[PDB]
Write a protein that binds this ligand. Structure first.
Ligand code: NA
Length: 143
């Protein structure tokens, strides 16, 4: 049961480079460990212009969700630190937006939730609630 009219969402786009690593979220699904590589490229469109306070207001008033264009990469298998296979997904946002998000905890939290949601629906995943920023590794895998 719910009554809200809007919710933040991934606007899936075709990845277009040049991409580069950003940061990596470790989490689990119902099936195993998952790494989400939040990457960025200038050729991913930005979200519509909005200030942090305008966006919080729209959330409070249920007048919009944050709609972030992002590519939702296909899975690639990678080894974790213990030598076990895990699934990684590369999710790219716009570079200007990424630079803004570096200076905002609020925008970062939105991106993480939205990337999780996009991958969950695209790949039929049930990510478990806990997740962690990888401190010493911006990207799980190569490139
Ligand atoms: Na809402």
């Amino acid at each position: 049961a719910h009554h809200h009219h809007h919710h933040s969402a991934a606007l899936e786009v075709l990845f277009q480079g040049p991409g580069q690593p950003g940061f990596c979220i470790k989490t689990n699904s119902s099936e195993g460990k998952v790494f989400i590589n939040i990457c960025h490229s200038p050729s991913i469109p930005p979200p519509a212009d909005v200030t942090e306070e305008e966006l919080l207001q729209m959330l409070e008033e249920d007048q919009a969700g944050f709609r972030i264009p992002m590519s939702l990469g296909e899975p690639h298998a990678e080894l974790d630190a213990k030598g076990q296979g895990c699934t990684a997904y590369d999710v790219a946002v716009n570079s200007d937006f990424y630079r803004r998000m570096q200076n905002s905890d609020f925008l970062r939290l939105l991106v993480i939730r939205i990337a999780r949601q996009g991958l969950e629906y695209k790949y039929d995943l049930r990510l478990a609630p806990p997740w962690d920023m990888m401190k010493n590794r911006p990207f799980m895998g190569s490139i």
